[PDB]
Amino acid sequence: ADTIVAVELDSYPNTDIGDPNYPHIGIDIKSIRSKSTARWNMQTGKVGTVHISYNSVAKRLSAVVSYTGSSSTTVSYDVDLNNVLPEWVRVGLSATTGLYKETNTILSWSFTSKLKTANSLHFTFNQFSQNPKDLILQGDATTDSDGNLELTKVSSSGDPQGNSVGRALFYAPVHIWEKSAVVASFDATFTFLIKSPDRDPADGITFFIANPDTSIPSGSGGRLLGLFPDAN
Amino acid sequence: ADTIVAVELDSYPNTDIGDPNYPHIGIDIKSIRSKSTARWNMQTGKVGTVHISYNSVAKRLSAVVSYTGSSSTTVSYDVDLNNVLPEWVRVGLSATTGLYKETNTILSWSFTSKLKTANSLHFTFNQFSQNPKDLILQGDATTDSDGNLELTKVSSSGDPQGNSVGRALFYAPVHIWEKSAVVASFDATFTFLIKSPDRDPADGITFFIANPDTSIPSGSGGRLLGLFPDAN
Amino acid sequence: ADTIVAVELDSYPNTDIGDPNYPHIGIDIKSIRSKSTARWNMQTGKVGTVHISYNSVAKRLSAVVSYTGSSSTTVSYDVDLNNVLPEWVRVGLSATTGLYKETNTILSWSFTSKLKTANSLHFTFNQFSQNPKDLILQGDATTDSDGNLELTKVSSSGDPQGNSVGRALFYAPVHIWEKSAVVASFDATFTFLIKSPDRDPADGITFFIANPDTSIPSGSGGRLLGLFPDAN
Amino acid sequence: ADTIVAVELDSYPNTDIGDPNYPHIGIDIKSIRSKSTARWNMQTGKVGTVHISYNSVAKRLSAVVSYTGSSSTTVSYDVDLNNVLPEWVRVGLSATTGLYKETNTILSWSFTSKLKTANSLHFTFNQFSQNPKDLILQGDATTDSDGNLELTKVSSSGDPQGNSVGRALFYAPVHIWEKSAVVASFDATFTFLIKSPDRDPADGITFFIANPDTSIPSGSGGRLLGLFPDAN
Ligand SMILES: [Ca+2]
Ligand SMILES: [Ca+2]
Ligand SMILES: [Ca+2]
Ligand SMILES: [Ca+2]
Ligand SMILES: [Mn+2]
Ligand SMILES: [Mn+2]
Ligand SMILES: [Mn+2]
Ligand SMILES: [Mn+2]
């Protein structure tokens, strides 16, 4: 299958597949069952920001999610990503809706990769354009007239549709390690707007890192965040 | 055909196609016949650096080439690149050898694009890896065991071959304008090592900007720098 | 006196000192009497953005001012700033009110300087803190509880006071040229919020570059933008 | 006294003050007695590179030192620097010689600080100029005709002098935390050239972070790296 590293913002607790019993952020290493989680005071209708970082000396993947005027949620996991991921990857965003639903609106996304053997890649998208040729849009992901990326289906009136799955991948492969590297790092930031008519919105949004040829696995909708074919 | 904007470092004067009678740098707008040139005191066997910039408010494309301990050469051309190039492009490097020849060794290459509607793309390659998945290598272009990019053919003993043509394009398309942009800019830097057994090395090296689907035109070897199918 | 290069956003036309008869942006080289102006459709109560750039090869200082949903204003002036400014400078923002007045609220400010002999300096302030130790606040300039920089006096109810003058300078000197430079460039961005009770707000806001020891000249209030001791 | 966080490159083992019995790199938190060390295969006469990073979510300060063709040395220490350092700091480099000596030549230094409440500061010095107005040079630190920073005394023939102490601080204070920060990070890189006539060169080189008003403590020469007044 694919090889996935993800930071999930998991709005829907699926205790049946190992979620804790609250919305949470999680570090996912080759499984939906997060290796580390933290409770997330999800706020619908408010714009949130997520920052993710890692460097290969610290071997600590971390993420922080916050909204204006609120406490941040943090999560960290000790991991050498070179033992998990291939040396060339694609970076992406994923989101899913299920029976319950939510918008998974990305307003901005930026990413920096460094590889000192200092090789680097940086992109920053604040306005997504109507046909973004440096993104590979998969499933239901589209950009809208407001210049936002809609990971999952929303109606023209701005209402989220159920059972949607969408991903956006930066077009260029990212070099995250190599045999002569002294140190590799990456940082990602996105802002996101989750709105929902539902008391329990579902399912979540991720930033992820995959084999470059990654595509939405069959059976990966809802709780699997468009990342994993099963909940192992 | 393709649409090309290039900064050439033209080592070989081909007065028959409008070159001035000396090595020169040039700004090429949809033609090998540079819209502006400056005389270049080409130094073989020394590492040189080229910096190219443009922003859409100034509407002035410029370049500077220097070596340590030497005078720099500068060239500028007033041009609104949105009247020349499509809004999505690829950026690349090209080089050619002819009957006379030279290495067209790139040691480092970096590029930054900005589009404020602040969207950006930045890459920097200081060590080119043995299979660079974020470059599209065309013609004879390869990376070598020293972690350099060889635009044109060199033997294992490091001797340049004649009648070579090679290009390297950054894999991701670059968004250089759009209908809602307030200002777009880009900057590129490369370092290069031209060595030659010849008293008149040929042919030259370029940084270029093209339609994303660009490929080496038929008939584009030698003086045409792997950019143009003819010398119109 | 000081040596000043500025981009003015001049809201108040003072035809008596050479202003054109409308709000305008201007490039000021050692004089309030702009070397180049463009008409500015000033919009009070809307957040605007200014981008300024220059590089030493192009020798073209330019600026663009825009608001969301509106046309941008651009201005350019051909100038070699090394013939104007010393090699070490400070960068700053200035603003003034007169009998008529306006807020000169800066919400964000960023600046990048490059000097390839690639030496660089970059700062970005999105939230100004209550005591910003990397700024030299002069005259009435203060930061407020919203994390904005108030160049000129505003009451706690948010009303602009008249006859105010304030400047904010980045604490560290900036190296903009030197004897061995091949190319020097800089870019600045700020966002600003000008609100006014007045049908003709006054006086304006600038980004400026000065001798490092610059201070508000005596007699520099109002139309002189806290930059110049007179209108020569 | 001062408050110091440092990454030391400690060439001289002073087992009497807690050094391990080999050259080593170390993370120093308010004491010369490193909280974490790693053995360093110091190579004199070869240019080395050090990268240091930290972010406040991971709470892990790390460093890596390498030379071309050699193994890197890494060291990490878990620490929340906001519990150690004040919110405003200066960043600097220090080096000392003793009875035994070494050059402490810095060829390049760069630093990036981020504070997302995304405020940032970045500098990069590849060529140090003859009078660097954005550095505060303390003790014997000077820049030389090659455009390098000599932290400790070297003769015009390039021979290191003994019992030297010098530091270079970036002129502007750096904001590393504040009450509303969601995440703060920093990265530093320097390259360095340690040459010595001695079989056991002394004493070492550091990157450090201090209260902004930091100055070379009395009694801080040699093993104390110009950082600490004693070896507690
Ligand atoms: Ca879930
Ligand atoms: Ca030619
Ligand atoms: Ca005026
Ligand atoms: Ca020691
Ligand atoms: Mn989960
Ligand atoms: Mn030519
Ligand atoms: Mn004016
Ligand atoms: Mn030690």
Side-chain angles (χ1 to χ4, degrees), chain A residues 1-49 51-67 69-232, chain B residues 1-49 51-67 69-232, chain C residues 1-49 51-67 69-232, chain D residues 1-49 51-67 69-232:
Chain A
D2 291 332
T3 309
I4 304 294
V5 168
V7 170
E8 50 167 73
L9 282 59
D10 196 332
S11 61
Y12 202 87
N14 304 94
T15 56
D16 39 316
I17 61 150
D19 280 351
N21 203 28
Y22 37 69
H24 55 280
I25 65 165
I27 288 158
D28 296 352
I29 310 295
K30 304 180 303 181
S31 169
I32 202 66
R33 303 184 181 246
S34 305
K35 298 291 175 204
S36 187
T37 62
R39 189 205 270 258
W40 171 47
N41 189 11
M42 255 217 68
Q43 322 208 38
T44 64
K46 290 176 146 229
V47 171
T49 305
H51 305 93
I52 294 98
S53 58
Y54 167 84
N55 74 87
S56 69
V57 173
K59 290 167 198 334
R60 177 169 280 167
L61 178 56
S62 63
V64 53
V65 176
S66 58
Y67 305 88
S70 325
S71 343
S72 85
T73 307
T74 64
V75 65
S76 277
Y77 189 62
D78 291 353
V79 67
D80 180 352
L81 292 181
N82 194 48
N83 292 160
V84 179
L85 284 162
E87 306 187 332
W88 285 102
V89 291
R90 276 192 170 105
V91 297
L93 300 177
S94 82
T96 50
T97 58
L99 302 305
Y100 288 138
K101 69 208 149 280
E102 76 195 22
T103 63
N104 296 109
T105 307
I106 307 298
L107 289 44
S108 64
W109 176 37
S110 69
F111 174 80
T112 294
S113 194
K114 275 151 151 56
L115 220 208
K116 297 99 170 310
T117 55
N119 286 27
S120 66
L121 174 75
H122 167 80
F123 62 89
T124 180
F125 307 128
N126 294 278
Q127 119 106 190
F128 299 87
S129 81
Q130 275 271 54
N131 184 19
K133 301 187 166 45
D134 47 1
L135 292 183
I136 300 171
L137 306 174
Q138 296 172 335
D140 301 341
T142 57
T143 56
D144 71 14
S145 49
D146 289 332
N148 301 317
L149 166 59
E150 300 286 359
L151 284 173
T152 47
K153 283 259 107 53
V154 298
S155 72
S156 19
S157 89
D159 310 336
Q161 302 306 124
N163 308 107
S164 190
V165 57
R167 312 162 149 195
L169 322 168
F170 189 64
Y171 190 65
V174 178
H175 205 176
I176 55 171
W177 187 253
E178 57 176 309
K179 268 81 204 345
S180 62
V182 159
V183 56
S185 68
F186 64 79
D187 291 278
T189 296
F190 60 94
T191 70
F192 59 95
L193 179 55
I194 300 161
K195 305 194 293 189
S196 189
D198 290 330
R199 271 184 68 271
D200 328 322
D203 267 293
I205 243 168
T206 82
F207 168 84
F208 71 104
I209 314 200
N211 52 293
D213 53 311
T214 184
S215 65
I216 301 177
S218 184
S220 67
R223 65 247 266 147
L224 270 15
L225 289 343
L227 296 186
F228 299 104
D230 54 54
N232 298 165
Chain B
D2 291 332
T3 309
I4 304 294
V5 168
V7 170
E8 50 167 73
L9 282 59
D10 196 332
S11 61
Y12 202 87
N14 304 94
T15 56
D16 39 316
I17 61 150
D19 280 351
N21 203 28
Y22 37 69
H24 55 280
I25 65 165
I27 288 158
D28 296 352
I29 310 295
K30 304 180 303 181
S31 169
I32 202 66
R33 303 184 181 246
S34 305
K35 298 291 175 204
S36 187
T37 62
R39 189 205 270 258
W40 171 47
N41 189 11
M42 255 217 68
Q43 322 208 38
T44 64
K46 290 176 146 229
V47 171
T49 305
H51 305 93
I52 294 98
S53 58
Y54 167 84
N55 74 87
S56 69
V57 173
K59 290 167 198 334
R60 177 169 280 167
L61 178 56
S62 63
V64 53
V65 176
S66 58
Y67 305 88
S70 325
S71 343
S72 85
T73 307
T74 64
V75 65
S76 277
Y77 189 62
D78 291 353
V79 67
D80 180 352
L81 292 181
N82 194 48
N83 292 160
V84 179
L85 284 162
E87 306 187 332
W88 285 102
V89 291
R90 276 192 170 105
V91 297
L93 300 177
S94 82
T96 50
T97 58
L99 302 305
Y100 288 138
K101 69 208 149 280
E102 76 195 22
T103 63
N104 296 109
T105 307
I106 307 298
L107 289 44
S108 64
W109 176 37
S110 69
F111 174 80
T112 294
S113 194
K114 275 151 151 56
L115 220 208
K116 297 99 170 310
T117 55
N119 286 27
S120 66
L121 174 75
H122 167 80
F123 62 89
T124 180
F125 307 128
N126 294 278
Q127 119 106 190
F128 299 87
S129 81
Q130 275 271 54
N131 184 19
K133 301 187 166 45
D134 47 1
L135 292 183
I136 300 171
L137 306 174
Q138 296 172 335
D140 301 341
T142 57
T143 56
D144 71 14
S145 49
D146 289 332
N148 301 317
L149 166 59
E150 300 286 359
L151 284 173
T152 47
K153 283 259 107 53
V154 298
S155 72
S156 19
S157 89
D159 310 336
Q161 302 306 124
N163 308 107
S164 190
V165 57
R167 312 162 149 195
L169 322 168
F170 189 64
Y171 190 65
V174 178
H175 205 176
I176 55 171
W177 187 253
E178 57 176 309
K179 268 81 204 345
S180 62
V182 159
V183 56
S185 68
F186 64 79
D187 291 278
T189 296
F190 60 94
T191 70
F192 59 95
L193 179 55
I194 300 161
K195 305 194 293 189
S196 189
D198 290 330
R199 271 184 68 271
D200 328 322
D203 267 293
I205 243 168
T206 82
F207 168 84
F208 71 104
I209 314 200
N211 52 293
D213 53 311
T214 184
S215 65
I216 301 177
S218 184
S220 67
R223 65 247 266 147
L224 270 15
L225 289 343
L227 296 186
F228 299 104
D230 54 54
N232 298 165
Chain C
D2 291 332
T3 309
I4 304 294
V5 168
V7 170
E8 50 167 73
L9 282 59
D10 196 332
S11 61
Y12 202 87
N14 304 94
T15 56
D16 39 316
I17 61 150
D19 280 351
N21 203 28
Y22 37 69
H24 55 280
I25 65 165
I27 288 158
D28 296 352
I29 310 295
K30 304 180 303 181
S31 169
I32 202 66
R33 303 184 181 246
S34 305
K35 298 291 175 204
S36 187
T37 62
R39 189 205 270 258
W40 171 47
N41 189 11
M42 255 217 68
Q43 322 208 38
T44 64
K46 290 176 146 229
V47 171
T49 305
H51 305 93
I52 294 98
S53 58
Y54 167 84
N55 74 87
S56 69
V57 173
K59 290 167 198 334
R60 177 169 280 167
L61 178 56
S62 63
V64 53
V65 176
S66 58
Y67 305 88
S70 325
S71 343
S72 85
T73 307
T74 64
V75 65
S76 277
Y77 189 62
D78 291 353
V79 67
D80 180 352
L81 292 181
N82 194 48
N83 292 160
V84 179
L85 284 162
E87 306 187 332
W88 285 102
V89 291
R90 276 192 170 105
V91 297
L93 300 177
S94 82
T96 50
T97 58
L99 302 305
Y100 288 138
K101 69 208 149 280
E102 76 195 22
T103 63
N104 296 109
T105 307
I106 307 298
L107 289 44
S108 64
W109 176 37
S110 69
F111 174 80
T112 294
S113 194
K114 275 151 151 56
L115 220 208
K116 297 99 170 310
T117 55
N119 286 27
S120 66
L121 174 75
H122 167 80
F123 62 89
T124 180
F125 307 128
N126 294 278
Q127 119 106 190
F128 299 87
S129 81
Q130 275 271 54
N131 184 19
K133 301 187 166 45
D134 47 1
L135 292 183
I136 300 171
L137 306 174
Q138 296 172 335
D140 301 341
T142 57
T143 56
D144 71 14
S145 49
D146 289 332
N148 301 317
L149 166 59
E150 300 286 359
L151 284 173
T152 47
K153 283 259 107 53
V154 298
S155 72
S156 19
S157 89
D159 310 336
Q161 302 306 124
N163 308 107
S164 190
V165 57
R167 312 162 149 195
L169 322 168
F170 189 64
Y171 190 65
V174 178
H175 205 176
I176 55 171
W177 187 253
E178 57 176 309
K179 268 81 204 345
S180 62
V182 159
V183 56
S185 68
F186 64 79
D187 291 278
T189 296
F190 60 94
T191 70
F192 59 95
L193 179 55
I194 300 161
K195 305 194 293 189
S196 189
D198 290 330
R199 271 184 68 271
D200 328 322
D203 267 293
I205 243 168
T206 82
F207 168 84
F208 71 104
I209 314 200
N211 52 293
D213 53 311
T214 184
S215 65
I216 301 177
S218 184
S220 67
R223 65 247 266 147
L224 270 15
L225 289 343
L227 296 186
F228 299 104
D230 54 54
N232 298 165
Chain D
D2 291 332
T3 309
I4 304 294
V5 168
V7 170
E8 50 167 73
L9 282 59
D10 196 332
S11 61
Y12 202 87
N14 304 94
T15 56
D16 39 316
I17 61 150
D19 280 351
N21 203 28
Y22 37 69
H24 55 280
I25 65 165
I27 288 158
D28 296 352
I29 310 295
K30 304 180 303 181
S31 169
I32 202 66
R33 303 184 181 246
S34 305
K35 298 291 175 204
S36 187
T37 62
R39 189 205 270 258
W40 171 47
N41 189 11
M42 255 217 68
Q43 322 208 38
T44 64
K46 290 176 146 229
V47 171
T49 305
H51 305 93
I52 294 98
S53 58
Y54 167 84
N55 74 87
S56 69
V57 173
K59 290 167 198 334
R60 177 169 280 167
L61 178 56
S62 63
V64 53
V65 176
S66 58
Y67 305 88
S70 325
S71 343
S72 85
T73 307
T74 64
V75 65
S76 277
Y77 189 62
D78 291 353
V79 67
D80 180 352
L81 292 181
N82 194 48
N83 292 160
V84 179
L85 284 162
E87 306 187 332
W88 285 102
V89 291
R90 276 192 170 105
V91 297
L93 300 177
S94 82
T96 50
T97 58
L99 302 305
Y100 288 138
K101 69 208 149 280
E102 76 195 22
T103 63
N104 296 109
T105 307
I106 307 298
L107 289 44
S108 64
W109 176 37
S110 69
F111 174 80
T112 294
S113 194
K114 275 151 151 56
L115 220 208
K116 297 99 170 310
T117 55
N119 286 27
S120 66
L121 174 75
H122 167 80
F123 62 89
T124 180
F125 307 128
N126 294 278
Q127 119 106 190
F128 299 87
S129 81
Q130 275 271 54
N131 184 19
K133 301 187 166 45
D134 47 1
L135 292 183
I136 300 171
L137 306 174
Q138 296 172 335
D140 301 341
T142 57
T143 56
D144 71 14
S145 49
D146 289 332
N148 301 317
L149 166 59
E150 300 286 359
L151 284 173
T152 47
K153 283 259 107 53
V154 298
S155 72
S156 19
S157 89
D159 310 336
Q161 302 306 124
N163 308 107
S164 190
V165 57
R167 312 162 149 195
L169 322 168
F170 189 64
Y171 190 65
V174 178
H175 205 176
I176 55 171
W177 187 253
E178 57 176 309
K179 268 81 204 345
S180 62
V182 159
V183 56
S185 68
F186 64 79
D187 291 278
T189 296
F190 60 94
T191 70
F192 59 95
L193 179 55
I194 300 161
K195 305 194 293 189
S196 189
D198 290 330
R199 271 184 68 271
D200 328 322
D203 267 293
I205 243 168
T206 82
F207 168 84
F208 71 104
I209 314 200
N211 52 293
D213 53 311
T214 184
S215 65
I216 301 177
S218 184
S220 67
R223 65 247 266 147
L224 270 15
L225 289 343
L227 296 186
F228 299 104
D230 54 54
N232 298 165

